[PDB]
Amino acid sequence: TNVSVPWGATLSNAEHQLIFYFLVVAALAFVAGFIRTYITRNEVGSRYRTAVSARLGMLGVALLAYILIIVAFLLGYDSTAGGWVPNDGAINIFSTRYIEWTVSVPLLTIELLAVCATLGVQARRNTAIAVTATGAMIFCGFLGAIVIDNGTNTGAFILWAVISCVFWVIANVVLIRAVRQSLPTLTPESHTMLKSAAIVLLAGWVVYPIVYFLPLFGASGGLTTTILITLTVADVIVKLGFSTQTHRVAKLRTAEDVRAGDDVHPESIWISSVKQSDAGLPREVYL
Amino acid sequence: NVSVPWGATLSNAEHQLIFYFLVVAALAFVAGFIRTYITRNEVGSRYRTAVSARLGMLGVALLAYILIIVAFLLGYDSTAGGWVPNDGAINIFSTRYIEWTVSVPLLTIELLAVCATLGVQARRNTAIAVTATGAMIFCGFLGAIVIDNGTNTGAFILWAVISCVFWVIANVVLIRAVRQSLPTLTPESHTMLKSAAIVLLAGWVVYPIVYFLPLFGASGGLTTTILITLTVADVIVKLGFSTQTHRVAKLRTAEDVRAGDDVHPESIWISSVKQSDAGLPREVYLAE
Amino acid sequence: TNVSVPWGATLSNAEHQLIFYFLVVAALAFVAGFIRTYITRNEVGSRYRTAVSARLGMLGVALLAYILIIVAFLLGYDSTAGGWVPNDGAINIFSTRYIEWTVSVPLLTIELLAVCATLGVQARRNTAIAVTATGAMIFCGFLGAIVIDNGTNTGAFILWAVISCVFWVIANVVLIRAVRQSLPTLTPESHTMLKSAAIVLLAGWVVYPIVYFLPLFGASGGLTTTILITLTVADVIVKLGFSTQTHRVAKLRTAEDVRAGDDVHPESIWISSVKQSDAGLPREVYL
Amino acid sequence: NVSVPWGATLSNAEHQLIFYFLVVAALAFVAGFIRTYITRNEVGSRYRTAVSARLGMLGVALLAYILIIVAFLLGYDSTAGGWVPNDGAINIFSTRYIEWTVSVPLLTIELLAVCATLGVQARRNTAIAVTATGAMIFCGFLGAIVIDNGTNTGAFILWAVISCVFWVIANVVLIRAVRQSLPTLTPESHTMLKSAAIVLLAGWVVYPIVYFLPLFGASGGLTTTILITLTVADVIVKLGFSTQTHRVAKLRTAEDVRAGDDVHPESIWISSVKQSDAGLPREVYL
Amino acid sequence: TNVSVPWGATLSNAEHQLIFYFLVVAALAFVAGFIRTYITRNEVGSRYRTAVSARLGMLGVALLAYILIIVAFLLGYDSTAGGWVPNDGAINIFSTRYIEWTVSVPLLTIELLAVCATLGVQARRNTAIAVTATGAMIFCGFLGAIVIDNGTNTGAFILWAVISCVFWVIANVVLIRAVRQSLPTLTPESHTMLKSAAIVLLAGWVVYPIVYFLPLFGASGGLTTTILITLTVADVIVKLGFSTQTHRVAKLRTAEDVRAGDDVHPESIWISSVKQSDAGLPREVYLA
Numbered sequence A, C: 001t002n003v004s005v006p007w008g009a010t011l012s013n014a015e016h017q018l019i020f021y022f023l024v025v026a027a028l029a030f031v032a033g034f035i036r037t038y039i040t041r042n043e044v045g046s047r048y049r050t051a052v053s054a055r056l057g058m059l060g061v062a063l064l065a066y067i068l069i070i071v072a073f074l075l076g077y078d079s080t081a082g083g084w085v086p087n088d089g090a091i092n093i094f095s096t097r098y099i100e101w102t103v104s105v106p107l108l109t110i111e112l113l114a115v116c117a118t119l120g121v122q123a124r125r126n127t128a129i130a131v132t133a134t135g136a137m138i139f140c141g142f143l144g145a146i147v148i149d150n151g152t153n154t155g156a157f158i159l160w161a162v163i164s165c166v167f168w169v170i171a172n173v174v175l176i177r178a179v180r181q182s183l184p185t186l187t188p189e190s191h192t193m194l195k196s197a198a199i200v201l202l203a204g205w206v207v208y209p210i211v212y213f214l215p216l217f218g219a220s221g222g223l224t225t226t227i228l229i230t231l232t233v234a235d236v237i238v239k240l241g242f243s244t245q246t247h248r249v250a251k252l253r254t255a256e257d258v259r260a261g262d263d264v265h266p267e268s269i270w271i272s273s274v275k276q277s278d279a280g281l282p283r284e285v286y287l
Numbered sequence B: 001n002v003s004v005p006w007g008a009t010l011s012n013a014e015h016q017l018i019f020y021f022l023v024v025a026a027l028a029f030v031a032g033f034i035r036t037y038i039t040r041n042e043v044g045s046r047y048r049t050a051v052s053a054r055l056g057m058l059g060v061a062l063l064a065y066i067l068i069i070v071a072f073l074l075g076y077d078s079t080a081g082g083w084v085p086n087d088g089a090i091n092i093f094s095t096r097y098i099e100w101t102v103s104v105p106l107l108t109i110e111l112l113a114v115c116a117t118l119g120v121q122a123r124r125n126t127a128i129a130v131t132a133t134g135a136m137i138f139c140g141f142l143g144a145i146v147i148d149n150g151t152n153t154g155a156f157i158l159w160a161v162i163s164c165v166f167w168v169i170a171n172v173v174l175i176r177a178v179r180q181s182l183p184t185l186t187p188e189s190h191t192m193l194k195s196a197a198i199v200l201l202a203g204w205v206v207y208p209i210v211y212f213l214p215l216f217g218a219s220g221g222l223t224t225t226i227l228i229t230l231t232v233a234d235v236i237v238k239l240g241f242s243t244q245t246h247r248v249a250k251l252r253t254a255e256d257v258r259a260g261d262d263v264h265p266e267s268i269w270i271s272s273v274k275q276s277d278a279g280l281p282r283e284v285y286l287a288e
Numbered sequence D: 001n002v003s004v005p006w007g008a009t010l011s012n013a014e015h016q017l018i019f020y021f022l023v024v025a026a027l028a029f030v031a032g033f034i035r036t037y038i039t040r041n042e043v044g045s046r047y048r049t050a051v052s053a054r055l056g057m058l059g060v061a062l063l064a065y066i067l068i069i070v071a072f073l074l075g076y077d078s079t080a081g082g083w084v085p086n087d088g089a090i091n092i093f094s095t096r097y098i099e100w101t102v103s104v105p106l107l108t109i110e111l112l113a114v115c116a117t118l119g120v121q122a123r124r125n126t127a128i129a130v131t132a133t134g135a136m137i138f139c140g141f142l143g144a145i146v147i148d149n150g151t152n153t154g155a156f157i158l159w160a161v162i163s164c165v166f167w168v169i170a171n172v173v174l175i176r177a178v179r180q181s182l183p184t185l186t187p188e189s190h191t192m193l194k195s196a197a198i199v200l201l202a203g204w205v206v207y208p209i210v211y212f213l214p215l216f217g218a219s220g221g222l223t224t225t226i227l228i229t230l231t232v233a234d235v236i237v238k239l240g241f242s243t244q245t246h247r248v249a250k251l252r253t254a255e256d257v258r259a260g261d262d263v264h265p266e267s268i269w270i271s272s273v274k275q276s277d278a279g280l281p282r283e284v285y286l
Numbered sequence E: 001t002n003v004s005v006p007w008g009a010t011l012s013n014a015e016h017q018l019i020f021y022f023l024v025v026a027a028l029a030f031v032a033g034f035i036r037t038y039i040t041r042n043e044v045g046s047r048y049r050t051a052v053s054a055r056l057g058m059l060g061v062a063l064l065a066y067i068l069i070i071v072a073f074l075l076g077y078d079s080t081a082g083g084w085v086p087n088d089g090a091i092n093i094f095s096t097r098y099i100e101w102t103v104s105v106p107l108l109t110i111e112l113l114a115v116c117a118t119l120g121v122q123a124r125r126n127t128a129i130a131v132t133a134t135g136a137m138i139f140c141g142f143l144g145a146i147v148i149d150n151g152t153n154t155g156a157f158i159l160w161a162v163i164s165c166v167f168w169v170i171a172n173v174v175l176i177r178a179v180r181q182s183l184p185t186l187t188p189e190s191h192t193m194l195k196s197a198a199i200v201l202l203a204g205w206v207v208y209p210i211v212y213f214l215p216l217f218g219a220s221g222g223l224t225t226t227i228l229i230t231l232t233v234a235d236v237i238v239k240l241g242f243s244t245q246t247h248r249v250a251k252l253r254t255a256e257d258v259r260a261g262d263d264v265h266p267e268s269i270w271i272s273s274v275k276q277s278d279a280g281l282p283r284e285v286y287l288a
């Protein structure tokens, strides 16, 4: 065994305060994000609404998930004057984050595929692969780090990490393929946005696997702190940063459909205070 | 004697897996509930019953799973790598029955809502399905959780059979209603309705099977299998089925628009393929 | 006979499970009802919106009320070798239901009067009498069964029950009068619906007074169970059963106003998959 | 010297009655809040401040009463003598002050919103009313709860007088604003506004009276009367008044439609009598 | 350690009551604010919607944040013969407020920048600086007062306060520059409102740094009380005061766009009972 479980390390009063600060800040940031997303939901045409439902869905999940994480943190540690001594429920803090990713990540895939130009079965087939792959990716990590031998088996820890990486590649390929296939059909402005969004999500993903293997280089209050805080910053940056991108795309693509005269939108669409489309009503219909 | 599943002690790994699936399920429903709500006006007033039912069931399922999670957290006590069941462990299974009692009946209405059944034929069908589905679950609750604290092998089987009677009544009514509708619906609508019906009716089989597992003995592993399986089942059927009935409602809504029977204020899409165009009702000048 | 308070009887593990099952199922059913009512709120014209606001209001109340009832139930009994022994808080279970009715019943009256053709003062006067009568009816029952001598006084139990019945008649008369007076002015189809709705509510009401006097025929775990479960079934059946009816009415009356050309509705109105009215927009106005 | 009401022991009957009214009140507010929200688009954009204020106050009142209920459940302990007050019993009365501090000010804005006050005259009035009403409650809190745990009879009376000063300032500003508006409004609108103002301003008298009751001694019965009365008062004034200001907003909205000053997308009704017909804004080219 | 942590001072029953009163009042005021903001969300054109989303976002955060603060306060002190004695969790009361500011303040910046006329890159770049600066400003303060040596290092308390002030100036400059640059393009009425809003936010901000250094003048139940109440009044006044202003702006700017014939709004826009714009519908379009 070379695996030093992070929920075994004792935390300083300062460390305990920092972890709580970032966790709650994150949760609040998501509530702010969720509120924004909801209010700016009708800025997108019915065609790209899947992008909105997915985003709002993930933010909702992330929000609640982080509430559990916070609770586990508060009920997972005891003050001993030598710092904060882990309980039997401290493991739940790490466990809870996996639960979040299991649901949050799959929704992120659909969100990206939603703004992609994939049509008919090609689209439906891609989603199924991505969702299943992303879900499996996280589950495999959960099995190795938490489930198997209480995450103390160095063999399993590494084995399932590799199995997970397999799924990670499957996901990256399907998404990259779908983005690259769509880019040609999109306008230059839309093409750029989609690419930007894809990069933010796919690129960020790398941080998670790296943090997973840190426990191998030993255990410590500081390390445990780094692991938790980093993952929090990662979750907030990716989820919020990426979400804003997919939205701007949906709007651009919506405005384009309006200008092209393919569809109509009941309000004017703006981006950085630059009008993209004008308000329009459908034609009155007789029966 | 029936080996009650809430009597079996669970490993730290088993306890973690059950929690993982339960919470994931609840979160999945939140995601589902949110989507359903946002995509509620993608359907005409005619098939709104399908939306209200779906959102209703997801809402119920969501809250129900919160209770299940709570019961699970208060149902077991940690004994150094093992989780020993307490008096409240039974509530975990009990809570799921409460969920089904309300969730299943709504699923029936949701299916019947997208069906072409008209007038009394429709209203009569719903009543039978709802009552049957509710009874089906209640019977199971009595046999497994209520009667002799779920330790009576005779009752466990008796009420299971009584339940199966109701299960057949439900399957028949729904299958007949779907079969009757399919002919009047378009090919695209026909396919979707059939697909939706299969997902619900087919999945249902899993529940009765898992019910009788406790007869083949008791164990931490078995108890784990029972819980996880039911969770996966609930999520897959409820979200799988729900997604289908929605796609139907939209298709049927778009058709009514194209046919010029009604109008919708926004364009309707399915897999990024336009089904109907945005249209406004004609302005009318009242006597004034 | 003499009054045997139901919160004094010890309950079996089976009885305890049954009561919890029905209580939670009821609360969830209300959530389902509340959600439906809210989503199907714009299926009714502004004229009959009082019917919707009242329904949603009562369902909201019922929902929260049942949450308290459930809490009281969980804190009302203690698990022993003899089953579930009642504590000091067991009385709160029954008390809470009265609180529910005090608010829920009055709203039901307004809901019925809302779909009635009562105009001007005749309408406003009726509401005041019904609300005050219904509120008093429940309050009187609360005083006799719970408040006065801790519900151990057989005399009060009966006296206030009679006083309550007086109010019950006052309410039934006002409502019946209003329904009978309206029926003539409405269409045959609307006439039938209103009558049906009135019957469902007024008829069900009888169950409550009957269950009130059961404690006189003695006390027992089984009886206590019957009292609770029956009232739960009653609440759910009446509240959802009646509500669905008054809604169907509001829609029919709304569709009629549209067909008659008295008003316009922005969406088509349906009943059992039969179109009642077509979608229409108001005429554009220059100011 | 002042017989604090949270010192008196309560009977099982008294305890049950207080709980009954508290919860009923909270539920009534939920019912009110729901209605207010659903009937929010029955009013023109011009008088929307009246709606936002009402929904705001009902929301506050609702949550406030939840705390009051919690405080009540943790404020008394069941004994052989009935329900004995603990250290947290004071919080029950304290919580109500918190409610009023926020609820009352919103009620003023709600009334001023349906008033015809224009420009600075309007903005100035609201500020005075809000600040006065907030101070009024704060002063009462200081005398009855904060200062010597409400045991100083001098302060109890002093701050009550200081509060009454603010109470007069508020009543004057509101009455002036209502009187100034009445002339510009229709007879039907005039009557409603007056009715609404009376319900709020008149009811207000009950609160100061109940405040000074503790001076005439302490008792389980008195304590019960104080709590229940204030609850009935809160419910009656808040829902009674609110319903009135709403009816006004609608009438004033319908008038603007008929007068051809604005347009509303749905027909407006009052007691089943059509006030305005549905109208759509004219489609405009840019 | 010339720093006298405020969570070390014991509080009187009167002090304890006053703190609770203001905290809850604040939270309720935000609920009232949040409700208003939500209902009056469609009083603004799509162009200035960022101003609404930001405000509703901050009010939502502030609301929840104050709930935690209230909880921390209830679990932070224990009632004794000497009054209310601070426990280990008393520090959390102050800690929680920092969490609030960390999220609330940044959103306030975006809210102001949203009503500003900044276009293209200049606008996007400004937001990034403001958000990062404001977030850092609060984080730095948190490090000095709470994180470092449990807030006992007098040197750090001052050092990080200075580092924070640096960020405070960076933020004030960016915002002031953006407001000054916009003023010229806006109408006189709009110009005045924007200026008023900016003043309320930027001016109020000064109170926070001042209250931060009060613990240096010693410790007291009274001092601790003053610090908490003042910050609460500050939060409520700035957040509601400023928010109301930025809203009035968004409406004026929306009405202007309508009058100028640049866009259309489906309802009439009013300010203090004075009509600014009339209701207008987009022109019906026949698609190809």
Ligand SMILES: *C/C=C(C)/C=C/C=C(C)/C=C/C1=C(C)CCCC1(C)C
Pocket (backbone or CB within 6 Å): A101, A104, A105, A108, A137, A138, A139, A141, A142, A161, A164, A165, A168, A205, A206, A208, A209, A212, A235, A238, A239
């Ligand atoms: C919003 C949160 C996101 C997108 C989280 C993403 C997490 C991953 C991409 C994790 C991947 C992993 C591996 C590829 C190997 C190690 C185990 C995982 C699950 C951390």
Ligand SMILES: *C/C=C(C)/C=C/C=C(C)/C=C/C1=C(C)CCCC1(C)C
Pocket (backbone or CB within 6 Å): B100, B103, B104, B107, B136, B137, B139, B140, B141, B160, B161, B163, B164, B167, B204, B205, B207, B208, B211, B233, B234, B237, B238
């Ligand atoms: C979303 C949850 C669903 C659809 C649950 C369905 C459950 C059943 C179909 C259960 C059926 C049963 C029998 C037919 C026999 C034994 C008892 C039951 C209730 C498990």
Ligand SMILES: *C/C=C(C)/C=C/C=C(C)/C=C/C1=C(C)CCCC1(C)C
Pocket (backbone or CB within 6 Å): C101, C104, C105, C108, C137, C138, C139, C140, C141, C142, C161, C162, C164, C165, C168, C205, C206, C208, C209, C212, C235, C238, C239
């Ligand atoms: C939704 C709940 C409803 C409609 C409850 C209704 C309750 C009654 C009609 C109760 C009537 C009573 C009497 C007439 C006599 C005894 C006391 C009462 C309150 C149970």
Ligand SMILES: *C/C=C(C)/C=C/C=C(C)/C=C/C1=C(C)CCCC1(C)C
Pocket (backbone or CB within 6 Å): D100, D103, D104, D107, D136, D137, D139, D140, D141, D160, D161, D163, D164, D167, D204, D205, D207, D208, D211, D233, D234, D237, D238
């Ligand atoms: C909905 C609740 C309302 C309107 C509460 C109103 C309360 C008052 C008008 C209180 C006034 C008081 C005085 C004028 C003197 C004594 C102290 C007060 C605060 C009770």
Ligand SMILES: *C/C=C(C)/C=C/C=C(C)/C=C/C1=C(C)CCCC1(C)C
Pocket (backbone or CB within 6 Å): E101, E104, E105, E108, E137, E138, E141, E142, E161, E162, E164, E165, E168, E205, E206, E208, E209, E212, E235, E238, E239
């Ligand atoms: C709604 C809450 C607001 C606007 C809070 C603002 C807080 C500050 C502007 C704090 C500034 C500080 C410094 C510049 C120095 C000392 C540390 C701080 C964080 C209090």
Ligand SMILES: CCCCCCCC/C=C/CCCCCCCC(=O)O
Pocket (backbone or CB within 6 Å): D063, D067, D070, D071, D091, E016, E017, E020, E024, E027, E028, E067, E070, E071
């Ligand atoms: C909307 C704000 C909610 C705040 C969280 C409330 C959680 C439950 C607490 C209830 C309060 C209990 C009674 C009042 C205590 C007052 C203590 C004091 O005197 O300082």
